Amino acid sequence: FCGSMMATGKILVAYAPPGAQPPTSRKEAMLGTHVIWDLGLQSSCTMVVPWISNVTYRQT
Amino acid sequence: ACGYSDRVLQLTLGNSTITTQEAANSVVAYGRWPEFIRDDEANPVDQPTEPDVATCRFYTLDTVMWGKESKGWWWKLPDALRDMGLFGQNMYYHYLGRSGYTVHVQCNASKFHQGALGVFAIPEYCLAGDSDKQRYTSYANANPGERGGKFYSQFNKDNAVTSPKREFCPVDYLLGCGVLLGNAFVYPHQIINLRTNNSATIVLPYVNALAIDSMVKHNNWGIAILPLSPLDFAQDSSVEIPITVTIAPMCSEFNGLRNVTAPKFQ
Amino acid sequence: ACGYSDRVLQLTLGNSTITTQEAANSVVAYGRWPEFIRDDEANPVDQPTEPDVATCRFYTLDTVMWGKESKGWWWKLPDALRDMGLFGQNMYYHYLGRSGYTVHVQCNASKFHQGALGVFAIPEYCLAGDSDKQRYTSYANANPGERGGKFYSQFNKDNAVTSPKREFCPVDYLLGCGVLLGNAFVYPHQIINLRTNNSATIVLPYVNALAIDSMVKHNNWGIAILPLSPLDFAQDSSVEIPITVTIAPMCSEFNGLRNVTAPKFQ
Amino acid sequence: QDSLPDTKASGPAHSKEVPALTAVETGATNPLAPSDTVQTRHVVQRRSRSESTIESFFARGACVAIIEVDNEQPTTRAQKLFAMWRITYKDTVQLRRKLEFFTYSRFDMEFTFVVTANFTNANNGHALNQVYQIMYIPPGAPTPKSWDDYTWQTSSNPSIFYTYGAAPARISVPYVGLANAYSHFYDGFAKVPLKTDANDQIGDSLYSAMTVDDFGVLAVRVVNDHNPTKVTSKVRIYMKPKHVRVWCPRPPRAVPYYGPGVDYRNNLDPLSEKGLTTY
Amino acid sequence: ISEV
Amino acid sequence: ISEV
Amino acid sequence: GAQVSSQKVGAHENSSTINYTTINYYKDSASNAASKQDYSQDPSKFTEPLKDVLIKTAPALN
Amino acid sequence: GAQVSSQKVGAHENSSTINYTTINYYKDSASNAASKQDYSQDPSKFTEPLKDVLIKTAPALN
């Protein structure tokens, strides 16, 4: 986050494994893997996209 | 030294994580963490389903806005989650269901805003009706789902004795149920006071007079959020900031499988 | 002495029990009973849901009628169970799903009726299409759900090259896929020969080239029931008797939870 | 020691053990031996099944492709100065049918390349010995648009440079599947149409196909610049599965193949006529 | 070497 | 020789 | 690294265990030849995949 | 001077440590093939080149 120190906010970042409709609303996005980021002194937030796959290797 | 604070927390359940950097510690209601029914407290004899990570994860409800004239909001559990993913499906496919919850209420503002929200978790939160008829709020009106309900500043009696609304009329300083709001602090609670914190986290055990019950007929807990001190900012007269409620089922187990319940809400 | 017979069996899974008094023992396909993914064969890293008794129970599909001119029936798994209680919900809420099955086919008649049904469980049962276009059967037509499909005695090519049907055209003596029906006995199978037995029971492990896959995109097993010897009775020319198929998921585990898949079937 | 079991001597029987009766309804084959129904002598059996192991059944190079490539002056029309073949065993039928006795397989693959050339024109001088480049282009790598564009630099794709007249070229490839076994049959789709899709094309895919590009392509060219006379060549590719494991046996294909799926169309009558009581 |  |  | 194994001799000259030698020259096992010393198994998973397998002298249906 | 090493086997025949043999024929090491038995290392010099490396559960800025 590169806002000023006086700015606050909470953000939801999500990962939906394939096969359903791509999320268009927070309501759908929050049913998959997600992190709710609270902005503050630790400036950054990491979401890990876990390996969730049918095949053992995907194509590039 | 390395820096752990009771203001910074991470909660992870299933595939969902919450972080907050301005918490005020967290409450475990009545000192009891949730747990499954023990064999010596068990009552239905069929093997329970325990969906585990499929239902015990954080679901975020629709955000509500806190403005200067807001009187408060209330939700009931499990009702607010009845349509949430596989928690709702398991709830409606089974006669009996049991669950504890982590409730995380989110409200950030700035160092120049002020206001304080009281977040109370109430076992058996019976609310008062809108008319001369007693105990007449209907099932669909008593159960708003994730939308929740609101409080009012005064008792507005429904008078259309012809087509009665059959709604609750929760008056705020009476906690919607005939007691004084100031004593609601005997219930598990936190305050989000904007100069101090931006979230409240409360862990709720299953509380009931039975080890397991019908989730469709009975709400175990009510969540009441009221402005103990109203929102204010700079010198503007119409400040509004979001309040978002995220709740996760914990130790969910269900008994009595059959065809799905389809309540009539509309 | 006390009387156990390989003709009389009870199967209990979850809250459902099946009895038969005229079985012909039971087949465990390829000698492998179903099992969960072992850690050393695991591939998605998220914790799986294992609904256990909520999904691993017997679901009975709609009965079909066997008459003198019936050519056969086929279903695919997991497709035939896609709308069955909480098995269907877990299947559509998760990217990945794995399951073995107990299949119990039921057909009783009398000591004066005759006929023999071949019940075959086929891994990767690819079926042939109805036209000059190759590999053109559409998703909705390849997946009939619990309704299943039928076999024909001959190849009827779809000719409306304008609005092609995009359906399978399974010819019976070619097992719907270009091989001779007589060799289908290399697949796990039983025969319901009416003078001998009134049911077939086959236990199917999960078989695939992967430890877990998309249940929505891929069917692991096909069930094909064909009259090896046609139905006949007394001297009547229009005898019909029911065939009912009851199938139970076994060792179900699912990975990759998100919002629900809603396929377009119509 | 790999011989089949010996025949045991057996004599007359009058008993309640009845191995000749059974019930095939159970799904089982009756494991009888001749000594269960006739009197046999002892025979020390020396035959073995050495030649029908899975490895010996597949241990042959089978032709899977004939690629034609020319070396002539680059004109402006469509020419065959380079050719591309999508790697598959389904362009020919003989190896396809042997692999399809099974649903899944796991093996390493040996490719041997036989290259032959000839003149096409009675005479416009001759040609000096040709060198051929066979480049493997995996799914995603750039494909050549002309016989000498930059892709032929092959810095990362593997190439074979074969000299005409040398012994057939040969390389081995490991098990390169994305799954734990190759699927000879896939009952499914690569896409699913969803109710919220904008149109029906979005979720449409071919029945029983998996990835689009599968294993990629072999791009073949003659490296030499053209001579005045044109020279046509054919590269024949022979595949041999080695270190073979196979799972889940299937009935073999009984009617002609009609494409890369299991579809059929004609000659759906494989059996001939024979009287019920004619030897 | 290793005879087998 | 030297096996490793 | 030479592996020495016995050949199964068919026709015999008017001259015992005859051996042959193999050395792998490549690091990748895909380069290796096939050893063709292959074991076999029991067909039961296909010929008798029954939950209660019965003996052939006993009745199949009891 | 033969070096014998193990191959990492991918597909297995229905037949264990399979070895391969190498002999260098030239005096100059530039003539040698690559052994491709290569060790790896820690990315830290690029991913965490910090004077005080902190543990991931602790705050990055204290």
Ligand SMILES: CCCCCCCCCCCCC/C=C/[C@@H](O)[C@H](N)CO
């Ligand atoms: C310089 C020449 C290099 C040649 C490299 C070739 C790489 C590809 C080898 C593929 C062997 C294919 C065998 C068939 C597999 C298929 O059955 C299935 N569709 C896989 O699921």
Ligand SMILES: *C(=O)CCCCCCCCCCCCC
């Ligand atoms: C085991 O390998 C012991 C030593 C065998 C000696 C004979 C080696 C013959 C040459 C192998 C060369 C391989 C490629 C450099």
Ligand SMILES: *C(=O)CCCCCCCCCCCCC
């Ligand atoms: C170590 O090298 C021990 C001996 C190996 C014997 C096999 C040698 C094969 C020939 C190598 C010749 C190199 C060039 C003169």
